[PDB]
């Protein structure tokens, strides 16, 4: 449900094979209480796409797959109705949990 594709991209900011070690964005998306800071944190996570692309290309392993624009609008289309923070926390921590999986990228 459009979580694996964004989850692996989020993991791309944590894997040891990519020596940039951006844990602040993962902490920010994980510790989200309402809509605005969650969207801001996911925007900061998604902003590092050129860095990851030009670092993977210079290394040799296949480039990371940025989330496709078809599942981008799903994020707001689902989170607009999440007024209650209790239900928001579910996905706010699920994304961070997916960001810490193995996700073998560069062989």
């Amino acid at each position: 449900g459009w979580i694996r594709n964004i989850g692996r991209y989020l993991s791309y900011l944590v894997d040891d094979t990519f020596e940039e070690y951006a844990y602040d964005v993962v902490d920010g998306i994980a510790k989200a209480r309402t809509q605005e800071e969650l969207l801001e944190g996911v925007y900061k996570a998604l902003r590092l796409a050129p860095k990851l692309k030009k670092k993977a290309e210079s290394k040799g392993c296949p480039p990371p797959r940025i989330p496709s624009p078809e599942d981008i609008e799903a994020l707001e289309e689902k989170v607009e109705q999440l007024s209650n923070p209790k239900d928001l926390r579910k996905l706010a921590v699920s994304l961070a949990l997916w960001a810490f999986a193995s996700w073998n990228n560069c062989p």
Binding site: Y21, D24, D27, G28, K31, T34, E40, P85
Partner: protein, 336 residues
């Protein structure tokens, strides 16, 4: 003399009391949970904080600094001159003075008479079993509740990464196989409005815990084991340790961060007797609670003297309009 201080401090771009080690990349700042309203039921949020151990250690540093210059500065542990807080660790029976003289940890009276740091800050001697509760107590430096409610969580945290330029003598930046250490490491820097509360129990200085009184004349005369001048000097040393405290010397990474301090407001009370603890500055309604506590304590028969900076308090009770921290400690030492 017993004194309590509580207030707020503005503080931005501070990497104080981090978690990770120096050699580990991405040094992380400490986090602590707090409970707030957010216009509904109770909710817990995770915010950067400074532990009370850090504050207590920097109070110890300031006290040692201000007690060295006194004529009784010889009465100090050799570890104190090194700012070493390990007071009588596990597996030792004797300690070394500042001048090199040895002291035996058999009784508390001689320990507090000859060693000043172990008297103000307490000590533990597991090998012998001796005890002394610290006279100074400190709380956490938590961001104030109304500030947390007012910012809706922009994380108050910036992870800034930077590197050293360790290079070979020939001018080549080698890899890990060469021996160079040109690597990037990240430090987390916090910001916001914080609250602090430290209590001092300087009325028991120079008095052994076991035998507070001796009853020489069938009356409670305190068991002052040291000279009154030494006890007094220890008192203003502990009181003057607050001047480097509320100036930017209660944090780590001072060489590269040196936190940007400005005390916003505070209240201090002292009555040379038993005193209720003030309300921590973390709560948004601590001014009214402190005003009520002061008023009821004074009406109950306590000789509370109150100095306030940047708070209106009650406007009807006798409170001194102090202008800064060092003026406050000057007023405190004028009433010894």
């Amino acid at each position: 003399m017993y004194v309590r201080i509580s207030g707020r401090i503005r503080l931005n771009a501070h990497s104080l009391n981090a978690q990770g080690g120096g050699g580990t990349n991405y040094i992380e700042i400490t986090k602590t949970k707090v409970t707030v309203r957010t216009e509904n039921g109770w909710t817990v949020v995770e915010v950067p904080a400074i532990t009370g151990n850090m504050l207590k250690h920097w109070h110890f540093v300031g006290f040692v600094d201000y007690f060295k210059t006194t004529p009784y500065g010889v009465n100090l542990t050799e570890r104190a001159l090194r700012y070493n807080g390990t007071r009588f660790g596990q597996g030792e029976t004797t300690a070394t003075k500042a001048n090199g003289a040895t002291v035996q940890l058999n009784d508390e009276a001689t320990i507090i008479k000859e060693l000043a740091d172990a008297d103000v800050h307490g000590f533990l001697a597991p090998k012998t079993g001796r005890r002394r509760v610290s006279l100074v107590k400190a709380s956490f430096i938590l961001p104030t509740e109304d500030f947390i409610k007012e910012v809706e969580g922009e994380r108050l945290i910036t992870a800034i990464k930077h590197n050293r330029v360790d290079v070979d003598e020939k001018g080549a930046i080698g890899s890990s196989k060469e021996g160079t250490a040109q690597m990037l490491f990240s430090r987390e820097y916090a910001t916001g409005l914080y609250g602090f509360s430290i209590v001092l129990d300087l009325g028991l200085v120079g008095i052994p815990q076991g035998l507070p009184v001796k009853f020489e004349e069938n009356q409670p005369r305190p068991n002052i084991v040291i000279d009154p001048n030494e006890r007094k000097a220890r008192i203003e040393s502990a009181l003057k340790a607050l001047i480097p405290m509320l100036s930017g010397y209660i944090g780590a990474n001072l060489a590269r961060s040196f936190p940007v301090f400005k005390v916003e407001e505070l209240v201090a009370i002292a009555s040379e007797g038993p005193i209720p603890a003030l309300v921590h500055g973390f709560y948004e309604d601590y001014i009214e609670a402190n005003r009520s506590i002061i008023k009821n304590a004074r009406a109950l028969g306590f000789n509370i003297e109150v100095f306030t900076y940047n708070v209106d308090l009650g406007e009807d009770i006798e409170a001194t309009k102090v202008s800064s921290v060092e003026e406050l400690v000057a007023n405190l030492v004028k009433m010894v």
